[PDB]
Design an enzyme around this catalytic site. Structure first.
Site, PDB file in Angstrom:
ATOM      1  N   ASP A   1      11.710 -49.833  36.390  1.00 33.45           N
ATOM      2  CA  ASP A   1      10.399 -50.470  36.297  1.00 33.45           C
ATOM      3  C   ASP A   1      10.122 -51.318  37.540  1.00 33.45           C
ATOM      4  O   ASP A   1      11.041 -51.825  38.173  1.00 33.45           O
ATOM      5  CB  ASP A   1      10.302 -51.309  35.028  1.00 33.45           C
ATOM      6  CG  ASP A   1      10.260 -50.457  33.772  1.00 33.45           C
ATOM      7  OD1 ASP A   1       9.843 -49.282  33.869  1.00 33.45           O
ATOM      8  OD2 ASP A   1      10.622 -50.964  32.687  1.00 33.45           O
TER       9      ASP A   1
ATOM     10  N   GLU B   1      13.413 -57.659  37.871  1.00 34.50           N
ATOM     11  CA  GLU B   1      14.551 -57.255  37.074  1.00 34.50           C
ATOM     12  C   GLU B   1      14.813 -55.770  37.319  1.00 34.50           C
ATOM     13  O   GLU B   1      15.958 -55.345  37.414  1.00 34.50           O
ATOM     14  CB  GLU B   1      14.279 -57.513  35.591  1.00 34.50           C
ATOM     15  CG  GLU B   1      15.167 -56.699  34.659  1.00 34.50           C
ATOM     16  CD  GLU B   1      15.027 -57.103  33.204  1.00 34.50           C
ATOM     17  OE1 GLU B   1      15.608 -58.142  32.822  1.00 34.50           O
ATOM     18  OE2 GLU B   1      14.331 -56.390  32.443  1.00 34.50           O
TER      19      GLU B   1
ATOM     20  N   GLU C   1      15.753 -46.113  33.451  1.00 32.55           N
ATOM     21  CA  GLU C   1      16.609 -46.892  32.579  1.00 32.55           C
ATOM     22  C   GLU C   1      16.701 -46.503  31.104  1.00 32.55           C
ATOM     23  O   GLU C   1      17.552 -47.037  30.389  1.00 32.55           O
ATOM     24  CB  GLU C   1      16.292 -48.399  32.720  1.00 32.55           C
ATOM     25  CG  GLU C   1      14.830 -48.831  32.582  1.00 32.55           C
ATOM     26  CD  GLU C   1      14.042 -48.769  33.891  1.00 32.55           C
ATOM     27  OE1 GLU C   1      13.634 -47.660  34.291  1.00 32.55           O
ATOM     28  OE2 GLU C   1      13.826 -49.828  34.523  1.00 32.55           O
TER      29      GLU C   1
ATOM     30  N   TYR D   1       2.061 -50.639  32.827  1.00 30.49           N
ATOM     31  CA  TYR D   1       3.184 -51.569  32.697  1.00 30.49           C
ATOM     32  C   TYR D   1       2.731 -52.801  31.935  1.00 30.49           C
ATOM     33  O   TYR D   1       1.667 -53.335  32.220  1.00 30.49           O
ATOM     34  CB  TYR D   1       3.707 -51.953  34.081  1.00 30.49           C
ATOM     35  CG  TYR D   1       5.059 -52.625  34.061  1.00 30.49           C
ATOM     36  CD1 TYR D   1       6.100 -52.104  33.303  1.00 30.49           C
ATOM     37  CD2 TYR D   1       5.300 -53.774  34.810  1.00 30.49           C
ATOM     38  CE1 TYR D   1       7.358 -52.706  33.283  1.00 30.49           C
ATOM     39  CE2 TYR D   1       6.561 -54.389  34.799  1.00 30.49           C
ATOM     40  CZ  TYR D   1       7.581 -53.843  34.030  1.00 30.49           C
ATOM     41  OH  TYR D   1       8.821 -54.425  34.013  1.00 30.49           O
TER      42      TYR D   1
ATOM     43  N   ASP E   1       9.142 -54.349  38.171  1.00 27.83           N
ATOM     44  CA  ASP E   1       9.393 -55.783  38.293  1.00 27.83           C
ATOM     45  C   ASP E   1      10.728 -56.133  38.951  1.00 27.83           C
ATOM     46  O   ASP E   1      11.572 -55.266  39.168  1.00 27.83           O
ATOM     47  CB  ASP E   1       9.258 -56.458  36.919  1.00 27.83           C
ATOM     48  CG  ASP E   1      10.452 -56.227  36.013  1.00 27.83           C
ATOM     49  OD1 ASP E   1      11.209 -55.248  36.207  1.00 27.83           O
ATOM     50  OD2 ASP E   1      10.621 -57.034  35.073  1.00 27.83           O
TER      51      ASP E   1
ATOM     52  N   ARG F   1       4.144 -55.868  31.826  1.00 26.69           N
ATOM     53  CA  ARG F   1       4.536 -57.156  32.404  1.00 26.69           C
ATOM     54  C   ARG F   1       3.709 -57.348  33.673  1.00 26.69           C
ATOM     55  O   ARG F   1       4.051 -56.840  34.734  1.00 26.69           O
ATOM     56  CB  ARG F   1       6.023 -57.159  32.745  1.00 26.69           C
ATOM     57  CG  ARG F   1       6.941 -57.212  31.525  1.00 26.69           C
ATOM     58  CD  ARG F   1       8.379 -57.190  31.977  1.00 26.69           C
ATOM     59  NE  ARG F   1       9.316 -57.331  30.877  1.00 26.69           N
ATOM     60  CZ  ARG F   1      10.638 -57.326  31.021  1.00 26.69           C
ATOM     61  NH1 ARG F   1      11.179 -57.186  32.228  1.00 26.69           N
ATOM     62  NH2 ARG F   1      11.417 -57.464  29.960  1.00 26.69           N
TER      63      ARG F   1
ATOM     64  N   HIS G   1      -0.793 -54.236  41.666  1.00 27.24           N
ATOM     65  CA  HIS G   1      -0.535 -54.361  40.232  1.00 27.24           C
ATOM     66  C   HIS G   1      -1.815 -54.195  39.443  1.00 27.24           C
ATOM     67  O   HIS G   1      -2.912 -54.286  39.997  1.00 27.24           O
ATOM     68  CB  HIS G   1       0.081 -55.721  39.913  1.00 27.24           C
ATOM     69  CG  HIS G   1       1.453 -55.902  40.475  1.00 27.24           C
ATOM     70  ND1 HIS G   1       2.112 -57.113  40.453  1.00 27.24           N
ATOM     71  CD2 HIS G   1       2.295 -55.023  41.072  1.00 27.24           C
ATOM     72  CE1 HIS G   1       3.300 -56.974  41.015  1.00 27.24           C
ATOM     73  NE2 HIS G   1       3.435 -55.716  41.399  1.00 27.24           N
TER      74      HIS G   1
END
Ligand SMILES: Cc1cn([C@H]2C[C@H](O)[C@@H](COP(=O)(O)O)O2)c(=O)[nH]c1=O
Ligand SMILES: Cc1cn([C@H]2C[C@H](OP(=O)(O)O)[C@@H](CO)O2)c(=O)[nH]c1=O
Length: 563
Positions: free
Chosen positions: A87, A91, A8, A295, A89, A297, A333
């Site tokens: 990424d 989103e 992105e 990451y 997540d 988040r 994670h």
């Protein structure tokens, strides 16, 4: 011939390209590409989602993004496979979905690679066994966007009519503001209470000074409420005979904190470095995209075996055997940690001073969490004086342990040091010092300690904490002054209205339950449209009721009527 890889952003494309061979061609979409702009075509169009036609949506390519779209398509035909390395997540799963929709082609043409850090080995394993796009995570992401759009575009208009133009409402944002309003009201209604304390400075038999604090009187806690009571106690204490009732010597320890997660990072960055939530998350991201940290988040304090093994090796070489625990510390994670423990804050390349400071904080927390505890020799002296009992606390650092990685101490080091005294020893009163205090009101939320409150209530989400915090700020509901949150009058006016006519929407448990519902969609335990239908059903019954005249139980208008 070759493989196309899509990320992105430019910063991310550069970093990941160092770990991808000539077979791969990296290209950043440089943005979101595609997104959103008893019916009413009017509403549906503005929203871009249709609650009355089973939620069909109308996504549109972003401005100036048409060149990017076309630039990808052609690159797609010259490639045999397409890897979406957005990424990890939700989103990020949705964005991958949009890239796949826009470019088109057989689904077999696409793979969805996942990684929580951009390193040679993390990238390698990511493209070694690349998974498929997960439609459930995508549906969970869109369900969120849809209900957020619904509340914002269908509640806001009512607010313009009933209260004032330009106001906004947010599914979660309004719940976050509620916490601030209740906090603002607790503070405004607080009545400070008076209470006293009495200290005594004495002399050991040798003659060394010993400071004490009165704790009990007649075996009951000591806490007078005025000047007269303290004086009466003070007169009895001036004539009393002092002696060491008991000395308890016990070794204590303190343990390092667990590695950071999104919320704890924001709090520590705010408390120690003075960084607001926005700043911390923007630097965290750039650190992450530069390949320096994992990451940013996450809500997992888990650490991979290699990470632990690399840090243990660092601890062992740079600190020594006594700082290394028998076995690794397991926090239950991944957490936010540096990608390579051997890379120091001072060695970061294109990072500004503060971004290096955030890395330092992360690095120290990570190293510390795998080190042994610090040991202290704690002492507690109890003293008798007539019908009074007094106390003295103190401890000596025996082994620094994990605190060795933190800056050197310089303050009340060895918080208080008690002299040599044995049970039965006599103390000489030298001076009594009473002091007046007053109970304080509840602290005002900070951007970070609000995320903390949001986390505790299960309302936030690593990927939304930041947005929530800033998205409730420039709407006139709350403001940050002296780094603290203050509820505006309009924040209270709207909060009462919503609580009155949108009870379920403003309820904390229901808001938390919606996050669970969203997790259920992501985990194929609930279908997104049915979850949205239920949400909408509940929402519209609330809405129609609020729309009515207040004499029918509708929303109260923001007015004050004549005589
Ligand atoms: C003790 C305490 C501190 N804090 C914070 C927020 C800030 O990060 C820091 C104090 O910074 P400040 O003096 O600039 O407001 O400590 C809370 O939010 N809640 C608490 O209960
Ligand atoms: C983007 C996003 C992620 N998450 C959580 C759930 C995701 O796991 P599942 O999507 O549960 O794998 C995980 C992605 O890092 O973090 C949310 O709860 N809400 C969000 O909006």
């Amino acid at each position: 011939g070759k493989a196309l890889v899509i990320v992105e952003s430019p910063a991310k494309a550069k970093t990941i390209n160092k770990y991808l061979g000539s077979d791969y061609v990296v290209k950043s979409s440089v943005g979101h590409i595609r997104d959103l702009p008893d019916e009413r075509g009017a509403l549906v169009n503005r929203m871009g989602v249709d609650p009355w036609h089973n939620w069909e949506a109308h996504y549109e390519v972003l401005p100036g993004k048409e060149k990017v779209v076309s630039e990808l398509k052609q690159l797609a035909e010259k490639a045999d496979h397409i890897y979406l390395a957005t990424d990890l997540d939700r989103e990020g799963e949705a964005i991958a979905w949009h890239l796949r929709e826009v470019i088109g082609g057989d689904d077999a043409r696409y793979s969805r690679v996942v990684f929580n850090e951009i390193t040679k080995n993390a990238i390698r394993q990511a493209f070694n066994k690349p998974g498929e796009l997960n439609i459930d995570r995508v549906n969970a992401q869109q369900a969120r966007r849809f209900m957020d759009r619904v509340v914002g575009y269908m509640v806001s208009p009512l607010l313009w009519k009933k209260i004032a133009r330009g106001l906004s409402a947010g599914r979660v944002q309004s719940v976050a503001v509620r916490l601030v309003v209740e906090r603002e009201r607790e503070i405004k209604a607080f009545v400070p209470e008076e209470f006293w304390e009495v200290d005594a400075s004495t002399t050991t038999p040798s003659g060394e000074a010993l400071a004490l604090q009165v704790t009990h009187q007649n075996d009951k806690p000591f806490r007078p409420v005025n000047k007269e009571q303290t004086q009466a106690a003070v007169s009895l204490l001036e004539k009393a005979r002092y002696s060491v009732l008991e000395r308890e010597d016990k070794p204590t320890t303190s343990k390092p904190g667990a590695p950071f997660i999104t919320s704890t990072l924001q709090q520590a960055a705010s408390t120690r470095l003075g960084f607001g939530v926005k700043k911390t998350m923007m630097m965290a991201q750039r650190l992450y995209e530069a390949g320096y940290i994992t990451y940013m988040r996450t809500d997992s304090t888990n650490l991979s075996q290699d990470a632990v093994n690399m840090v243990r090796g660092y601890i062992s070489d740079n600190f020594g055997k006594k700082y290394l625990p028998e076995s690794p510390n397991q926090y239950a994670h991944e957490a936010i940690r540096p990608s390579d423990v051997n890379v120091m804050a001072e060695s970061l390349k294109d990072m500004e001073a503060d971004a290096q400071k955030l890395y330092q904080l992360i690095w120290r927390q990570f190293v510390a969490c795998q080190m042994t505890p610090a040991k202290y020799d704690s002492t507690t002296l109890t003293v008798g004086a007539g019908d009074f009992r007094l106390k003295a606390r103190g401890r000596i650092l025996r082994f620094d342990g994990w605190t060795k990685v933190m800056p050197a101490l310089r303050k009340g080091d060895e918080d208080r040091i008690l002299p040599a005294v044995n049970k039965g020893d006599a103390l000489t009163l030298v001076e009594l010092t009473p002091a007046q205090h007053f109970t304080k009101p509840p602290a005002r939320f900070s951007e970070a300690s609000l995320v903390k409150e949001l986390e505790k209530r299960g309302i936030g989400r690593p990927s939304t904490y930041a947005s929530i915090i800033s998205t409730i700020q420039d709407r006139g509901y709350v403001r940050v002054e002296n780094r603290r949150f203050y509820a505006e009058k309009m924040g209270e006016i709207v909060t009462d209205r919503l609580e009155e006519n949108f009870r379920e929407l403003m309820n904390y448990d229901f808001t938390a339950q919606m996050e669970n519902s969203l997790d259920q969609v992501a985990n194929h335990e609930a279908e997104w449209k049915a979850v949205l239908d239920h949400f909408f059903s509940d929402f519209t019954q609330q809405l129609d009721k609020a729309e009515k005249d207040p004499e029918e139980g509708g929303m109260r208008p923001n007015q004050m009527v004549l005589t």
